[PDB]
């Protein structure tokens, strides 16, 4: 049982691996603020908050890390002082350049990358860069009562208790997870067991691609009509009945709600912690939250 | 829509007055979510009382630093104070609990039932958590089914700043797991220099484990009293930011406390249980050497941090559901609490659910599992119509004082009880008005004619609660049991 003690010493080392990990966080809006707070309190070595946008007059006056009346300055700069005060042992850097213009060498300094408020093209490109450098990749967003998290940990090994063993779990790229072939006979069966939040994510990603923005409460009339059109185009492109996503979805997917940010940000940050520490199994590979029904569903989409 | 919410719901949130009971636990995350969601009129109260100052007032000061335009009303008196009557609770459209003290949660449950105000209850236990809604006549209340006491605390409190008294019993139970059990990072007992409140700066020479220092030492009891009760305590004093408003601890010396519940004997018991355990692992609350190790190690730490120690029977009664906390679990639960509150403010109480937070997905891929709220338990002794219980005791040995303090106040969670006998004459046993029935406290129940089958009507007018108590006389039980509730 010599291999038994090799796992035990590697299990207690999980906290040291967490305290030595550096994380990149892109997007410091409602969801990113919660993720940053949870990671900084968790004790990671460093956290880099990257956001190219500035605080707009349409942003809510009450914000977590951004002091009231900061309209005009960078969102990551305004979030620095409050984020750093959460834990002095964590060095919190601030980056203002566009994530899409960063070189590949910029990401190598990080052990994990978490994207929020990014387009589909940026999500895929960064996940491909991270897989190219063996960097753990995460993404998430919130919209109305709904939220989601995605993880791509490649070939991930961890320690789990029975009474303690080591396992391996294989993740797939986000590109394959976002374009699933539903024409197989086995896929059509899993299609009945797949939560509609996955297709809600597809509709909103397509909205963010075309409009260059997320649905807004101010323009709820025009946005909800376009969302109803996009869900017909996207679900027809995948060979699926458009009625798999009910028509009333436009009423519960607008703006970012603070309670939804806390739920999704809590689940996402804990998945990053257990991945950096390589302790406990991670969710493979999607998590979908429905704030209206109280549902938190883990789906494995991509493989096969 | 307004920030994803309908116009009518955002108005109810802006004009709605809510009550948060408890500044600790999930309260910090809950206050953030309430303010960020748009709740302007928030009342905060806890269990402490002043003559800084109270926890609610201290928490209000930190809230206004994050958002100065918040309208926080902080109370410096305990929620158990009789001033917070039903009329007080009727001011709010929603009450959210952040306490873990069972007696206070039972009280708030009864106050919200009497005020017909929805009460959101919750709990945490590591990765696990749950949220539910309590509404009179619709759902089951907090006491429809008994539930264990939540003893889930962050590692920063157990290791660095343990506010008495359960935090030391947890530290003693963590100490048992590190030395004689499955060593875990969530149950470390060493000084937590990663605590963000500590702001630990390394020294010049700084440029280790608790079980390893006992492994090479051969589990020396006198060496384990050292390092753990004097060197770790003197290392806590090097973190100066921890001792600015709270009193700092004082180390214990073995060569002094032994040369001069009992104080100096618990140090002797600490060295006796280590020698027995090293000859023999899973912690068992019915084990002789295991409970003696926890009782001695906890009481030694309770004296280091300046507080009255506790007996062995009280340590055994506690230390049941000791689960280390996970900070993200509080953030998830606090978010669900406000989500359930939005449904209540929307007039859609039927859409409320009991939500379970699991560690891993269930057989149906659900990590967060909702379920329909259960109807009121017809056998609940609190929220049912004309509730009754049966108590088995010796009417010739039980005094009125024992009935008042241990049965009606402790077991049945009444704050200010009035107890009379259903004998036609309305004989008064116990009065909530001080200066009336103190002369009865020493008398046996049989001196008032209470015999087998006697019925006592216990009224708690603050809680708007009436309980009928059937007396079953029994001379068995044993010379250690004074009473027991049937069923
Ligand atoms: C000293 O701590 C406390 O008393 C608690 C209590 C008082 C303040 C506090 C805060 C409440 C809050 C209200 C509004 C906004 C916009 C943010 C936060 N929540 C919190 C939670 C997690 C990380 C940081 C802050 O809730 C919390 C704090 O400031 O933590 C250091
Ligand atoms: Mg009261
Ligand atoms: Zn009940």
Numbering used by the authors:
A (entry chain C): 17 to 178, 205 to 346
B (entry chain D): 3 to 53, 69 to 224, 238 to 290, 313 to 332, 342 to 548
What does the paper say about this structure?
SUMO E1 is a modular, multi-domain ~110 kDa heterodimer comprised of SUMO-activating enzyme 1 (Sae1) and 2 (Sae2 or Uba2) subunits that harbor two catalytic activities required for activation of SUMO: adenylation and thioester bond formation. The active adenylation domain (AAD) and inactive adenylation domain (IAD) are involved in molecular recognition of SUMO and ATP•Mg, and catalyze adenylation of the C terminus of SUMO during the first step of SUMO activation. The catalytic Cys domain is split into first catalytic cysteine half-domain (FCCH) and second catalytic cysteine half-domain (SCCH) with the SCCH domain harboring the catalytic cysteine residue that forms a thioester bond with SUMO in the second step of SUMO activation. Although not involved in SUMO activation, the SUMO E1 ubiquitin fold domain (UFD) is required for recruitment of the E2 enzyme and the subsequent transfer of SUMO from the E1 catalytic cysteine to the catalytic cysteine of E226,28.
Here, we present the 2.45 Å crystal structure of SUMO E1 in complex with a newly identified, highly specific inhibitor of SUMO E1 (COH000). Intriguingly, the structure reveals that COH000 binds to a cryptic pocket distinct from the active site that is completely buried in all prior SUMO E1 structures. When in complex with COH000, SUMO E1 residues essential for adenylation are either disordered or displaced from the active site and the SCCH domain undergoes a 180° rotation that is stabilized by a new network of contacts with the adenylation domains that lock the E1 in an inactive state. Previous mass spectrometry and biochemical data indicate that SUMO E1 binding to COH000 is accompanied by formation of a covalent bond between Cys30 of the Uba2 subunit of SUMO E1 and an electrophilic center within the 7-oxabicyclohept-2-ene group of COH000 via Michael addition. Uba2 Cys30 is located in the N terminal half of Helix 2 at a site within the SUMO E1 AAD that is proximal to the adenylation active site and, indeed, there is extensive electron density projecting from the Cys30 side chain into which all the atoms of COH000 could unambiguously be placed. COH000 binds to a composite surface on SUMO E1 formed by amino acids from both the AAD and IAD at a location distinct from the active site, and ~500 Å2 from a total of ~600 Å2 solvent accessible area of COH000 are buried upon complex formation. The p-methylbenzene group of COH000 inserts into a deep pocket on the surface of SUMO E1 where it engages in an extensive network of van der Waals interactions with Lys34, Val37, Leu38, Val80, Phe83, and Tyr84 on the Uba2 AAD, and Ala78 and Phe80 on the Sae1 IAD. In contrast, analysis of the SUMO E1COH000 structure reveals a complete disordering of the g1/g2 region that exposes both Cys30 and the COH000 binding pocket to solvent. In contrast, binding of COH000 to SUMO E1 and covalent adduct formation to Cys30 results in a distortion of the structure of the N terminus of H2, including the oxyanion hole.
